[PDB]
Amino acid sequence: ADEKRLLKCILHDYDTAIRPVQNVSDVVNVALEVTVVKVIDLDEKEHVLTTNGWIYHEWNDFQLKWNPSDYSGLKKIRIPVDRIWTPDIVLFNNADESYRYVVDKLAVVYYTGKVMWVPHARLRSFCVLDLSRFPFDSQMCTLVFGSWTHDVSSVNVTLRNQSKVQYMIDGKEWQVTSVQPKRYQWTYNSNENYAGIITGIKLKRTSIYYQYVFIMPTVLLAFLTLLMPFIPPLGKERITYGIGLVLGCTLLLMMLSDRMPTELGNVPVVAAYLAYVFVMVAINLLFAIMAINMSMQQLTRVIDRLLFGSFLVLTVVITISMYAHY
Amino acid sequence: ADEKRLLKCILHDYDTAIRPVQNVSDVVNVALEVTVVKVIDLDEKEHVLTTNGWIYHEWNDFQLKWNPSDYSGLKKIRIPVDRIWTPDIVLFNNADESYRYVVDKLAVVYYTGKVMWVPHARLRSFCVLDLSRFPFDSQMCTLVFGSWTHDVSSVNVTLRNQSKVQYMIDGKEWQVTSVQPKRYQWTYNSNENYAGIITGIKLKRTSIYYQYVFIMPTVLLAFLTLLMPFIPPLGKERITYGIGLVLGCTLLLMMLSDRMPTELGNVPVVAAYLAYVFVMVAINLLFAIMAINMSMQQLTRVIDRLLFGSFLVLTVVITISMYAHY
Amino acid sequence: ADEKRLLKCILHDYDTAIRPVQNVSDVVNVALEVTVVKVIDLDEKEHVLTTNGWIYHEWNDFQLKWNPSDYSGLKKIRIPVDRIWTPDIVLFNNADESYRYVVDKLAVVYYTGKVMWVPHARLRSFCVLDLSRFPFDSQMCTLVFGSWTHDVSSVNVTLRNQSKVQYMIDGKEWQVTSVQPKRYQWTYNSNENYAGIITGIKLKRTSIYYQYVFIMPTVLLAFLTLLMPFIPPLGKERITYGIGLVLGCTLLLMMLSDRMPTELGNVPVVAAYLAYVFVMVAINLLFAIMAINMSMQQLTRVIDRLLFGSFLVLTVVITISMYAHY
Amino acid sequence: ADEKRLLKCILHDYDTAIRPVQNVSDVVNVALEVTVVKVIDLDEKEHVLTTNGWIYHEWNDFQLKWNPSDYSGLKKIRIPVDRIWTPDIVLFNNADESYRYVVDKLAVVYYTGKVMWVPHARLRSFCVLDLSRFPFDSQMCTLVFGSWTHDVSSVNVTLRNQSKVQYMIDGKEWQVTSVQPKRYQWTYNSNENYAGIITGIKLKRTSIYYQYVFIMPTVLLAFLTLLMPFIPPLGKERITYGIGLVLGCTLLLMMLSDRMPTELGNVPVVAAYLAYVFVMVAINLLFAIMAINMSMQQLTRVIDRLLFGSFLVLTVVITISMYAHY
Amino acid sequence: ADEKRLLKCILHDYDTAIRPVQNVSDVVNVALEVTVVKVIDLDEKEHVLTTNGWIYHEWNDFQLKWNPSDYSGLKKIRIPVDRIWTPDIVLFNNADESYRYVVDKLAVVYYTGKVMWVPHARLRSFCVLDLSRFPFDSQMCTLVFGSWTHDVSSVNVTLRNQSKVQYMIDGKEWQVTSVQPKRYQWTYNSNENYAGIITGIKLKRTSIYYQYVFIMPTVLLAFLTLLMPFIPPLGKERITYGIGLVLGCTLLLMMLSDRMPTELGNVPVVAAYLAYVFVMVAINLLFAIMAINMSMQQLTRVIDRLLFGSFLVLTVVITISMYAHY
């Protein structure tokens, strides 16, 4: 055939380690354009982001060079990567033990050595999450690419000439805002410098799950605690009501802890509000016990009325402070 | 022997990278028919679907050709895939890090190059699930196959001529309705175009587990809350009963949060009903507190009777709104 | 040496793809008998069965043939499978992504071509569980083996001449009853026919863990629920005691749903009894509420006495209905 | 160099399948001594033991034979296992799907063919646990090694001549008692026999975690239940206190069931004590209900005093029955 | 080209097993410098530490040598590890089944044989954690490297000449203090001796999650317990309040046990304080029961006043003893 002849005549002595350059001092302008097609998940327990995407490689090759006119056209040939040279561009903060690939076993070539190896992969990266806004958070994550082994003296990791990648991959759990990728000059040491590509993915949470699971039960428990001071001390249910709120707040705290991650910086607003209704319960149990001991003149009516007013105004201001996020 | 000499004569210089076509401009008509023999699971926590099945490959081969009359019949020979050409048809939204195979190490051949590579695999795909009807939902799943590396200019990914695949794989947990596969012409970019095969599996949930675990306790707590307004204010148990319902609703909310997935769009109907009975408990506890403070003329009888009637009508209408699904 | 000489002389041109037969129309009589030496687990959550065992392969080989008389005896030679032909017999409903092996890297040979390859493996299969009797169930499991690629026209998958495998692998968690293997002729399509070997493992549950965790607390909660009607209505404890039973039943339902699997058909007996004690606490709370509102002539004594009699007889008859299983 | 000359001159025709013996009837005396350097864990949920260690191989080799006198000394050469013959000695109850290795890629050799391959591995084995004494248990586990493929007619799996391996690997979670390895002749069938090596590791639980998490709360709730009969029937708190104990024992039962394994033989002592205190709560709630029923002559004082005495003596005798273990 | 001919001329007969030394008695001075760039996690459940980093390997190579002057410069060439010699330096207490690598498939070489292999890896090691100060702890962990197969007679595992690695890679969950690495001479046996490089990472916990989820609810439950002696015995709520505290403490214990690791030595301070609050509730319920029995002259007022004083001083002193950690 003809493709077999081309493979025989252009993979004669092509070692998979030799740098595909003519002049040793010259480098190869390896391009890159990473695209995320679907974000899988963002687990804050281990600060892992799992996003499905494809990485667009493109580099010139001095050794791969053939003319189509004598070889009957055939301007598109597909070569597996195991037989041609390959850049070592990998994601720096990969979560997986090994950097895995999907259909990264075949790369197209052109007559002017213009390979377009495009692996697809489930990138598992690390990003910092600011849970101060949690769950109404906008934790932007970063995907980073580059070569750990060789540096700018070997390859010039550059961005694609056409960077029309202003896409919005809207999902059912997150809304994704793509950020135009940039190039930064990494410095392994003082003498030598490396190259790197940064891309940004801004995640805005649009799922109702966390609101329904935390905000509604917590605010409604705060609602019952707001009505705590009304029960008369002699009813023998005031302290029982308070301890019931203790149990309910403890259950909500256990659930939130089961959900909210261990590796945390500042406390989330929902966790703070749950803690704050918990101390609400503590303080108004203090006042209920004081009132019942004093009952056995009865001026406790003014006391718990002003107490109710103070808790109304302070709880509503903390609630609006929390709501200002959304 | 005969098979050994046939292998020697037909694998002389068959590289595993060369496209098996005579004319370079011509393509190879690769067929496909995916069949699901047993669905394993559908985990909505990560929107993953695990289904066991086999995928049927069929393509003509120009190079592999022999006459059986001189070679003593032998119309069926079994060749491992590592020695012959192979299409890169893969599932687009694979959940696994790598696209794994089961007994995809041997493919049959015919004298007119008519290979029948039939891998078996545990396909792990992604689905979009409308949790509104959950658990009485019909979350359809799609399995999509195609070639990421090479495109229509290389292969024509086409459906089987005989598509009698109207089967129903009825399981003990899901009712599976097969959908006749379709072919869609994927467009990687404006200049180049690709091919793809999409199949559908409609999943009907027939498991008693979910409604037993959620609907029964939730409607039961709704029943108990419905009876709350009879408890006299002076009995010192109405508030205790209400806080007991608070604790029960909190426990049901914890179970729902543990089971119902985080990656959620609209709220499920069972979650809505649970939140609705939870705010029910809030409101009728408010009325109980107002009644007990007003007790210490006693018109609360008419008040809680009309209250009970209003909650009868609204609880029955929300319950029948839920039941309209089933 | 002599073993190296034999290997050089009898593995001259032995490709690992050629069918080891003299006449092409003739097939090779591959024997098989799977033996389970220790069952690991049976997880009903994903219908997975993990059993450790060994699979006995035995097939004649036309090509491998030498006389020991001129080769100084030596009737026992060990060959790794990577260099000899191997049947593709695999388990049809494997749960693992790939069909893995243990010490399946060496197979013995005889002078009259009687290879006795015996892999050991952790078989991970699928079972259908009739959990109506759960936990006092007898969920039988089936292990099925055969060749997906090649069929009866290639190999005759048969049982061993002697099938004395009537063993009982009694464990500390399961009673294992082996079933003699059977051969069934699988039909991939109308024109072609395949072969398969099925074996059965009857699993009796002898563990006390599930009993102690579910039946004892459930029946004792039902016991307390039975005593609820004796509490006088005016004691302000009947409603509190009833809601305490409601919370206890809710917690027990949480733990049961945590343990009992999602992929379910008919409801298990313990789950039915738990739902039934939920109904119990609901109904007797209804009657207690009616009694307390009616208290404010007091004929409720006859009412709750006949109520206790009716509920005692129905609870004991349902309890003996459950006990009839064990 | 010189080591390259050794490698060229001793790996001339070294096949990795030939048995390293001169006379075919003779066997090779393969020695072994497994050593555990750090036990990772013992999970009773799946009866798995994860222990880090190294396994010591030692066998004579006929083909490796060279004298240092003409070869400039060099008594120490390191050979990777891929080019040298190795025995198939593998753990008989391996828990992993495949038998994994750590730095089992290089083995030393001597001039008198005395290969000393010493792999390191995380052995994941199966052992039987007597949960009766749990947590104050001494569940000894066994590691068993041998050759599944070939038998005593091929290798004589023997123990090290110097077996001074009476070490104590004391950890922060388990007390490890080493047991001298023994050799047994495994019988695959009646005609042929195999070989095997047993080592024993006795695990004494010295952790305080299980005591603090189960014994303390269970005995403490038992302490509260012991004081239940003092509460007067008319105080309207005896029944509420009893149901609070019901909820407490239910919570401890849930957490214990979450921790205690499913694959269980006889009931653990802590589980038995928890069941005992739970039926304690049932019985004394029965007596409280009867006392309040007769409350509405009051001879109940003698009744609950003698009840307190009898249940105190039986509580303390069961407690000392538990304490006899520790 | 030039790199291709250099590779042909310098990988003529370079086996990947021969020690790269001229004199057999001489050793090769393999250097090492480990760097941790980002700690992932420290899971005390299995005493595992996951830290992302890179390992700096550097060794002389006698065979690998060229003169750049006649080879047109080219002072740095990139070579994959599969074709050159490699040290077997690995982490001694690796948690993973196999020692995995990231981009450890390419190593640079210099003209004076100064290979500078720099693998990157997710080190999963074992370290001892002193849970006494937990969560306000400083549990140091150790990473250790060395050669299990060959010893000092083969390689002199030395530390980097420039050890300016005094970096503080502070994260959002742990404050990381690097410790300058040291060299220790491991002794496999009496006759032979090995080498090893040890480095230390001091991990200070700065996360707010742990104290927020444990100490705050625990200290506030102790606070609520402290108010208990005020409730009058005749109010029929003191026993109910106490049993509510018992249930809350039981829930808190269940949550802590879910979080606190099983592999434990000394009890953590938070767990001890929780045990103290159980003792709190038990003792004050005992006194409450005694007071209510004695109520039916009333000198109990002095009793619970002095009880409050004694328990307040004991709780405040244990609280300040706990706070002395932070």
Ligand SMILES: *[C@@H]1O[C@H](CO)[C@@H](O)[C@H](O)[C@H]1NC(C)=O
């Ligand atoms: C790499 O490309 C950038 C793009 O502007 C250029 O500034 C830089 O000089 C290039 N470096 C090399 C070594 O080619």
Ligand SMILES: *[C@@H]1O[C@H](CO)[C@@H](O)[C@H](O)[C@H]1NC(C)=O
């Ligand atoms: C592929 O097959 C479809 C089936 O009708 C046909 O319409 C299309 O033209 C074919 N394309 C090529 C490139 O053969």
Ligand SMILES: *[C@@H]1O[C@H](CO)[C@@H](O)[C@H](O)[C@H]1NC(C)=O
């Ligand atoms: C396979 O063996 C069975 C055993 O009786 C026999 O009935 C059948 O004819 C055999 N088939 C072939 C193709 O040898």
Ligand SMILES: *[C@@H]1O[C@H](CO)[C@@H](O)[C@H](O)[C@H]1NC(C)=O
């Ligand atoms: C193996 O060694 C044991 C050690 O005493 C010996 O009793 C036995 O006879 C040996 N067997 C063979 C086949 O060498």
Ligand SMILES: *[C@@H]1O[C@H](CO)[C@@H](O)[C@H](O)[C@H]1NC(C)=O
């Ligand atoms: C290894 O290096 C250390 C560094 O001082 C030195 O003390 C020791 O003697 C060396 N050993 C060998 C065998 O070179």
